[PDB]
Amino acid sequence: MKTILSNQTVDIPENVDISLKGRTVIVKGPRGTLRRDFNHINVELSLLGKKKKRLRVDKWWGNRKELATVRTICSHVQNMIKGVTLGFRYKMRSVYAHFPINVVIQENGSLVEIRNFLGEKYIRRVRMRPGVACSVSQAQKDELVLEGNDIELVSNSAALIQQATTVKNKDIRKFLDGIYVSEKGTVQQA
Amino acid sequence: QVLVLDGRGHLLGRLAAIVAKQVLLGRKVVVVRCEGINISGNFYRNKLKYLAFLRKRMNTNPSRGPYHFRAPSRIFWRTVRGMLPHKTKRGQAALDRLKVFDGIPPPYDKKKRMVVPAALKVVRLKPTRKFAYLGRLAHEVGWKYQAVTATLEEKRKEKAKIHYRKKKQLMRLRKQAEKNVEKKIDRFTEVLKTHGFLV
Amino acid sequence: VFRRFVEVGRVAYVSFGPHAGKLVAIVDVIDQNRALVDGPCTRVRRQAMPFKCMQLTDFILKFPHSARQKYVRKAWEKADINTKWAATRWAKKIEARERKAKMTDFDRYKVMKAKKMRNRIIKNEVKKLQRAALLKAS
Amino acid sequence: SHRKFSAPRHGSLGFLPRKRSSRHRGKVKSFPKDDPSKPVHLTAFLGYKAGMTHIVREVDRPGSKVNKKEVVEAVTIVETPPMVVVGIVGYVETPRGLRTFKTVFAEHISDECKRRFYKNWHKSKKKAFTKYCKKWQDDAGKRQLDKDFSSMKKYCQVIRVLAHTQMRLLPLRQKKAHLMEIQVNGGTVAEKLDWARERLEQQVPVSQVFGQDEMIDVIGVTKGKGYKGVTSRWHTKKLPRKTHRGLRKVACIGAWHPARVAFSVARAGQKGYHHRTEINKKIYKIGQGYLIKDGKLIKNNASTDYDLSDKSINPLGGFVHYGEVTNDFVMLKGCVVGTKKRVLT
RNA sequence: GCGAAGCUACCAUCUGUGGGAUUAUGACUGAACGCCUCUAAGUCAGAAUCCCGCCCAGGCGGAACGAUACGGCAGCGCCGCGGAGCCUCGGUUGGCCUCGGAUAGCCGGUCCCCCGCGGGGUCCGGUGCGGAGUGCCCUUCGUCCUGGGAAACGGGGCGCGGCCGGAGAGGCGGCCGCCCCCUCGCCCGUCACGCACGCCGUUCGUGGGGAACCUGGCGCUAAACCAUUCGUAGACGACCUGCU
RNA sequence: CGUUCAUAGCGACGUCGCUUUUUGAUCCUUCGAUGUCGGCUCUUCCUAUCAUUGUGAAGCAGAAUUCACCAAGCGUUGGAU
RNA sequence: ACCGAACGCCGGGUUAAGGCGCCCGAUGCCGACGCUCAUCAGACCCCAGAAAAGGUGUUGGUUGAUAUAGACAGCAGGACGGUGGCCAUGGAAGUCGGAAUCCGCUAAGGAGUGUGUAACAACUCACCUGCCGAAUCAACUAGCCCUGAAAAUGGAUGGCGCU
Ligand SMILES: [Mg+2]
Ligand SMILES: [Mg+2]
Ligand SMILES: [Mg+2]
Ligand SMILES: [Mg+2]
Ligand SMILES: [Mg+2]
Ligand SMILES: [Mg+2]
Ligand SMILES: [Mg+2]
Ligand SMILES: [Mg+2]
Ligand SMILES: [Mg+2]
Ligand SMILES: [Mg+2]
Ligand SMILES: [Mg+2]
Hints:
This is part of a larger assembly, with chains A (about 190 residues), B (about 200 residues), C (about 140 residues) and D (about 350 residues). Chain A is of the alpha+beta class and about 190 residues long. Helix content of chain A is about 20%, strand content about 35%. Chain A has helices spanning about 65, 70-85, 150-165; strands spanning about 5-10, 15-20, 25-30, 35, 45-50, 55-60, 90-95, 100-105, 110-115, 125, 135, 145-150, 180-185. In chain A, the strands form 4 sheets. Chain A has a 4-stranded antiparallel sheet, covered by helices on one side. Chain A has a 3-stranded antiparallel sheet with strand order 1-6-5, with helices on one face. Chain A has a 3-stranded antiparallel sheet with strand order 2-3-4, covered by helices on one side. In chain B, about 50% of the residues lie in helices and about 10% in strands. With about 200 residues, chain B is mainly α. The longest helix of chain B has about 35 residues, at about 145-180. Chain C has about 140 residues and is α+β, with helices and mostly antiparallel strands. Chain C has a 5-stranded antiparallel sheet with strand order 4-3-2-1-5, with no helix packed on it. Chain C starts with 9 loop residues before the first strand and ends with a helix. Classes of the chains: A alpha+beta (about 190), B mainly alpha (about 200), C alpha+beta (about 140), D mainly beta (about 350). Chains in contact: A-C, B-C, B-D. Chains B and C meet through helix 7 and helix 8 of B and helix 3 and helix 4 of C. The structure holds magnesium ion (11 copies). One magnesium ion binds near residues 242 and 244 of chain D. The structure holds 3 RNA strands.
């Protein structure tokens, strides 16, 4: 049936400045700006408290398929506040049996070259999403670090280089090779 | 004596039925900006519908058989032709009356265009449903000129922004003139509001 | 972003139906698309009425959700929705539309002559403002 | 029932409006795309097919068995005299297509270019462009033409140039020169139109259009062969000797319920004289014509750095059914479409 | 026997292409289901599939340009404006334009800031079943005489010259210098207009579109086809050519 | 059944459906006639996919091979009887 | 061959059966209440197409439970001893299988749900606590939609189309 009201509040900390042009929210703070256009999502976005302490999301007269969207708007707002304050750092390890996988960044972290995957001669070039910085970390042998603000862009950039290193026409239960995501955290902890 | 209808946001068959009836009633209708026509049901449904329409073709001579027009204006002409009795002389006269355009030409860009709320997406579809633009549908079926039409519409949106700025300047002159003259048209302004104007 | 809510005490304007063009106090909410409706000083009886044929205004008045016509009549007369509605701009343009519908042919002739002379004077003033703005920008 | 033994189709379904070509000169259907980073240049040229000969050259690719060896190659000589630019034409991008906007011809148009505008040069009075050539030496006419150039520079997106061949320096019988639009691809529209205005009433040689070892496209009309049978036309299987009505025919057209004869069924009709564009032909050499400093210089055509002879590409007795090449030429690896004396893009 | 030319053979030789949407599939974020999840909203990769680019034909489809009948009679096109007379009809004031959202939007100065007088952002203020309203706006649709009041230096001579803008399928509009004339728009006193004696196709866009006669000024001088020839072509037609 | 393990691949005892590419069943059209089988040639179409492109599952370690999906674009030969 | 209705030539009115977005006359009602997303939607006796089975896709109903004596999923300690109990010797200290089938510590392990063994060993499920603190779980059943569901010329709710 149509549920008369589903509400949810997001209490933003004092290090975050958020505002909204209709359903188009913008979140700025320490690490930069992040915008998200919640048009075609069809909810109510109020912003209350002195200096806008909380973001309140309403769904009026919606059945189950649109009651399932209030918490995903709340989750995208939590992820955007986390990307603005603390950022997103995805660690991903190069698992190989015999051939050491050679990973090298080219401009800063934009283009990533992958070599010697299963002894192949074809180099694997991957463009990262705009805003995602790739790096080879220290005190670890073969491990990539993806830093950014947008969890969508960082995790999509991780999925691109995870699906680039796949084993074709073999038993992948035996050939456990590739660059796989091992840790999902933030840049700073606070 | 000529309607100028906008194809922006109007549903395909919902607009085509009203256009077909008003052209059979002896009235010149010019439907324009037909790549802004949206069709209810999402893009894969509408694309497979038009691809099945492309698969329907004459086996022996396809040049003799069905003519599959890719442009959105000619798709709208086809969906009005399927509603008009086009095998008769009055239906052919209705097809001669109807003029359909992609984009909006300089004979019609400087004309006030009409909106049909009985065929409009915000009025007819629920806001939680899906739809598909006929311009994107035509471009991914094979219509060539989405980008040229986009640049020409950008040029005329700049020109219409200049014209609307001049209209706002004329309107602020009109309001400040009414503010200056409302002491000497005191019994000219009152005899309109005692009969139902300006209030 | 909403301002007008279906509240116990909401004053609404009936768009169409039997009591078309009259004010309504919402007493209780029955369903998603049906409300409980009183009309104490607007000649509307207590009945149910759907939300389709009513346009809710920005007037609220205080009475509990099952009032037996007397406390809502007293709240109506205390908040004085009649004079505030007569002072409301939207009812002023509603009665302007009513005067336009009741415009007689002789009245329409007088209105047409007043339109003509008023538009000539305001157009001459607009032309004077245009030449003055040209002289100012010169 | 079905077909017992599966077989591929005789003939191509893409090449079957097989009518005689409405145009005699090979027309460009697709010019290369332009980007405002490279300088302005022509993208096409127009020459006449002269003949065929061998080329012995050194093979220089590794991995092959023919590495560091010598092969012979069948090549085409195409006599390509420098053309004359006599006009420009502008194009605008419309939602109905790509429409021409303004065509500005030159002041001094040669008689070879004027022969194209007439179907009968003898009975004509040679009156073409007589009131158009007066629009250059006056102030108001040159002002209106400069305003037309400015309107083209403002509104046109695609600029093509009008160039015609020189029939004076050719051994052919005809004197009516071929005209052609060539799209100038290069920088911006203003610099493009200024360069075309500079190249107006000028000579365009071959080296300004094409260079060494370039892979180009050949556009031309097929050598016509007449109303041929289906065996010569679609290369179908011949019926055996025991047939009664004929053995160079198609036996079965199709089935009863509709497989009435379609576009896909092979028939007898026109073979040859078809427009064809064939891609990826390598230019081995852009030759140099007969030039005089003291006497004739016949050496620079066919003498290489390994031959060091005094030969030109003209054979003993000249080219068969063409003439004698006295102009600069190109030489393409392979065989091009068309017969001798054929105009070729 | 040998064999020119021409046709001909994977029996010799040359050449044969790139993107977009995505299917299956694998995924990202993330609810429903305070946990998880390719999915419900959204997002990515994705192929002999599909579509287009390449190539072939070019619409009872258009476009730009050139020349347009000087003869031994003639005939055309632009301009200012006069005449009936035939044919075919539709009509019965026009609207000369923002983009845009639908769980929002319109209008101001911009005290504040940025960018190339304008645009954009912040704050504030007025309406929002839209009165800066297509439920809307603009023009009066009897005439002229004379003699007052409110308002106005406005209009006209397809007004003459200049400044321009408009190309998607432009075909129109604004602004200045100069000669002459008029009292037009709103109220009032003053009469007169075949007042055709009740009777229907009134009014007009319209100097409507096509053809035949006529008032003048300027500008002009041909092209196609048949006959001849060619063979890059060909059943005949048709096609490429040459000929003071 | 499969070393254990119903379902990787199979699957009894039962049961539900599709096709007119086989034979049956009927006689509705044709007996003032619709030329009756094969083979040769040639074109188009279907997918119930043998191979090729992209994939998922194996009792897939590699090679080889089975099951399944999108998919008819391109192929499916030369012969003795 | 179905429904309505039987027929001289016409005018006005009213209907049957069917319909009222356009073809095509009429819902151009400010129609009422819900259901439905279909990558094969559905669209009116005969009639021109579909089944068994399945789906937390979504909307209801039936039955039985527990939640302050402090639920459900979510991080977390464990499956011991009579007992290699008992037929199975070819091996069952839970283990291919079957008659058996309870006590003790007790907070708690069923003579056991799997991973797996010539046998073992080992990993690991009832119950509760530390953390979040109010509606949740399980089985049937009826709607609409989806899978099941594959044919040959291009193809038909009549078409256009329709959310
Ligand atoms: Mg393998
Ligand atoms: Mg076969
Ligand atoms: Mg015989
Ligand atoms: Mg792609
Ligand atoms: Mg998917
Ligand atoms: Mg993608
Ligand atoms: Mg017979
Ligand atoms: Mg027969
Ligand atoms: Mg299949
Ligand atoms: Mg044989
Ligand atoms: Mg009955």
